[PDB]
Design a protein around this ligand. Structure first.
Ligand code: ON6
Length: 328
């Protein structure tokens, strides 16, 4: 069977916290007053929630209200407990309240509101400096949640709110986030297609925080190369082929062989044989101002098949790529 794996950092954070910290099933929700919040307009609907702009009438301030759908019930307390655990962390969205929506009869989560620009608009605007600045800000959030024994598992542009005017960033949508327990086997059906790590795509369940670092690397590549998304698979199978067309098939086989994983036989006809490509291949006159030797080295160290070989968040923050970013 598959060889086991453990995170190289924050391995035992949850085992040394009190049980109530991670045992979310036993958590008891304390409700606020639903009449404090008036819905103003629908912002979005996903598989698991509807999100609204609202006004808190106790201060007349804009808030965000996320009305949870009754999908997987366990997700509800999991998300709530994770948000409370992380509240106050750097660039973590602040859960301000929890109310019972009278129409859905489900929890509505009340968040601080962030003024955002659609990433499709904004990423076309970012300078080299802006990219490094915001990547560093995301790393603060990820090192924080990893240090607190939590993996996000849905890092993607849509889950990073940026108020560009005030240079403010928040990591949102913790509905897929999970507590890391060494040796635990997790659902591989997480993350959005273009940001799924190789571990998910080869059905290796004993993954960790390093999943978020693959996802971040996918974001970085799309930004510095101006290619949205970078790995553009038409399904979860073709997603791995697209990655292997860049990182090569020999290192993919080395990866699955290390963990004694067997690829789905489905890949036999479609994977082919691919050399590892040099990152310089994706540089052209329209993105070269976003690329530097430092950017390419940093990206190279995030996008590794072996989840154990990727930079950790903290190591990433030490990288030369960030030397030019003014520290606050
Ligand atoms: O778990 C969450 C979630 N979530 O689940 O989506 C959202 C949030 C907060 C959000 S969502 C949210 C906005 C702002 C906008 S926006 O300013 O309206 C940006 C736009 C607009 Cl005008 C139109 C189309 C797309 C977007 Cl992104 C959209 C969505 N800002 C927020 O602070 C917190 C926690």
């Amino acid at each position: 069977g598959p060889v086991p794996s453990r995170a190289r950092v924050y391995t035992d954070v949850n085992t040394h916290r009190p049980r109530e910290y991670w045992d979310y099933e036993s958590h008891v929700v304390e409700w606020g007053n639903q009449d404090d919040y008036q819905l103003v307009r629908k912002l979005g609907r996903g598989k698991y929630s509807e999100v609204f702009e609202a006004i808190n009438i106790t201060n007349n301030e804009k808030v965000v209200v996320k009305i949870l759908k009754p999908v997987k019930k366990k997700k509800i307390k999991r998300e709530i407990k994770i948000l409370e655990n992380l509240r106050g962390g750097p660039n973590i969205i602040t859960l301000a309240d929890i109310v019972k929506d009278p129409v859905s009869r489900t929890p509505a989560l009340v968040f601080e509101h962030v003024n955002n620009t659609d990433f499709k608009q904004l990423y076309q605007t970012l300078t080299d400096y802006d990219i490094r600045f915001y990547m560093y800000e995301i790393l603060k959030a990820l090192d924080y949640c990893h240090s607190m024994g939590i993996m996000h598992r849905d890092v993607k542009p849509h889950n990073v709110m940026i108020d560009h005017e005030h240079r403010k960033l928040r990591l949102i949508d913790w509905g897929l986030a999970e507590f890391y327990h060494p040796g635990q086997e997790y659902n591989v059906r997480v993350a959005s297609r273009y940001f799924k790590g190789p571990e998910l795509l080869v059905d290796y369940q004993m993954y960790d925080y390093s999943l978020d670092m693959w996802s971040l690397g996918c974001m970085l590549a799309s930004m510095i190369f101006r290619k949205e998304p970078f790995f553009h698979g038409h399904d979860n199978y073709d997603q791995l082929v697209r990655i292997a067309k860049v990182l090569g098939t020999e290192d993919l086989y080395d990866y699955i062989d290390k963990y004694n994983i067997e690829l789905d036989p489905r890949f036999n006809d479609i994977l082919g044989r691919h050399s590892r490509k040099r990152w310089e291949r994706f540089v052209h006159s329209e993105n070269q101002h976003l690329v530097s030797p430092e950017a390419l080295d940093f990206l190279d160290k995030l996008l590794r098949y072996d989840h154990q070989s990727r930079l950790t968040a903290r190591e990433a923050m030490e990288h030369p790529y960030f030397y030019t970013v003014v520290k606050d």
